[PDB]
């Protein structure tokens, strides 16, 4: 209802899994080792982790998922938190991705 998305810039370069994010606005801050959400499409969203923050505001990023979908003009938003996954008894019995996505077959974040 009130939920909003925070934009830190656009992509400038991609090389395989690695990527570079150019800031949209000065005096914007991204914390280190935080996951970032790239605007792949109207509904699809990627996820990617920082590894360095440069003097120029440019940000190095490791793309964790949906690398084939990432492009240069795409938006980049900040979750503002470390990379976390759901954990608990409920996760048992379920094959999953590292991030937490369930891979199909035939609340507490750690």
């Amino acid at each position: 209802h009130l939920e909003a998305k925070q934009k830190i810039g656009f992509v400038h370069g991609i090389d395989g899994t690695i990527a570079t994010i150019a800031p949209a606005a000065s005096k914007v801050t991204v914390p280190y080792n935080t996951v970032l959400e790239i605007a792949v499409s109207a509904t699809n969203i990627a996820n990617a982790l920082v590894f360095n923050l440069e003097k120029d505001g440019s940000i190095g990023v490791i793309l964790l998922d949906n690398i084939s979908e990432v492009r240069s003009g795409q938006d980049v938003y900040a979750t503002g938190s470390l990379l976390k996954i759901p954990v608990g008894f409920h996760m048992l019995g379920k094959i999953i991705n590292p991030l937490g996505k369930e891979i199909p077959t035939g609340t507490k974040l750690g």
Binding site: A22, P23, A24, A25, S26, K27, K55, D56, G57, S58
Partner: protein
Amino acid sequence: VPSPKYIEIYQSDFSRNAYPLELLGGSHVDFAKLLYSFADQVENKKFEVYVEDFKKLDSIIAEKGPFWAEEKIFQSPTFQGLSEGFKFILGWIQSEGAIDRLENVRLAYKELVNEARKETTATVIVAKEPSGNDLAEI
């Protein structure tokens, strides 16, 4: 054809001068800072002039085609309408091959202008045509 005052600003160092906001980036920020120096000193803070030039420049680009770098801005009938200081910066950009970085420059210049007037710009996108009732709710 460049004016002596513009030459004096370019020959001098403006990177170490004070500006309303600190700007982050590579080399595009320097082009934007030069635009601001012109608008503050000789044009007497008529910032929107250059903001108009960018708009005008966009239209010119479409008529010129994608390879508008190669043409000289200082003697170009299409660029005659634009202001001389804007041409100075485009020529410096052309000399350094930064013309592909112009969009980053216009964003930087807009941020500096926005601070100098202490104004923040927000963008809204509609599907086809805006409606007044939706605008009032927005």
